[PDB]
């Protein structure tokens, strides 16, 4: 909650190679949900590969 | 690819008549890059390349 730095290093280590699932509605086919490796970025928006 | 990727690959591969550096002989892709970066030849110059 206090958002210390070591929390940020721990977060990097947990997300190091943990894939996440991205989805967009409507899910017309199975390509509407795909797994990506996350890269932590400053901001509030998800960056998507073109 | 779509949109800007296609447009860039199209523009870079187009062919222009009497562009700067026409008829030049290049040792390979590396020297084509060197000629483009040194403003010797244009992107659309007709050359002979090994």
């Amino acid at each position: 909650e206090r958002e210390e730095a070591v929390v940020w290093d721990i977060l990097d280590e947990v997300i190091r190679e943990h894939p996440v699932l991205l989805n967009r509605a409507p899910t017309l086919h199975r390509l509407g949900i795909q797994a990506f490796e996350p890269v932590l970025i400053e901001g509030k928006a998800i960056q998507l590969h073109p | 690819p779509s949109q800007d990727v296609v447009l860039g690959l199209y523009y870079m591969t187009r062919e222009k008549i009497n562009a700067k550096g026409e008829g030049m002989y290049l040792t390979g892709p590396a020297e084509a890059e060197k000629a483009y970066r040194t403003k010797t030849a244009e992107l659309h110059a007709r050359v002979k390349v090994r």
Binding site: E42 | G21, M24, Y25, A30, E31, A35, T38, T40, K48
Partner: protein
Amino acid sequence: SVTEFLKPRLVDIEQISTTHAKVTLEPLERGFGHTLGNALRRILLSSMPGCAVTEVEIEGVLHEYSTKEGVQEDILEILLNLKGLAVRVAEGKDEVFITLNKSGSGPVVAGDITHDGDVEIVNPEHVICHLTSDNAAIAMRIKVERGRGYVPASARIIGRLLVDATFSPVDKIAYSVEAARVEQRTDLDKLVIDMETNGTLEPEEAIRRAATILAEQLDAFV
């Protein structure tokens, strides 16, 4: 402080080969990766001193569009091969002449050139052209100058045929700028330079000389 800036802390030089290298510097201030990379690239491609073949004489050849019997390659192809011939000239000499004479059948190469000891050929296995008939002979008088950058034949416009001047030892330079973070500052810059030279110098030495030229150009202001 207002005059304190981030200097690179991780510098990694990976040598793919004796003429290819990749230098990674991290971290850099925001926007400095492009500044340094572009400046170094312009210096290394258009302002680096070096030695290269400039002019040629071939017996019986008057124009670059003329034909010579016994050689497989056309004259313009021969000039193209002469372009990519790495040479070192001893310091203090700004013009040298080398000769190449060969009769027979087979590939005539750069190692068949006789010099005066002040010229070193980095690539003796480089193929100059190919003689097809046993009765065919090639006589060649090559001029090597010292200059800066990449001066093409068209910009320099008797039987003297001009060869594109590849003075700079740099054959390829590319740079990419990626993200890098220290602490919570995620806006820092990391610079990756992939470099390939002809063999006259190692890529690291070439980067050193380019940086030296840039730094000395600013001496009157620092």
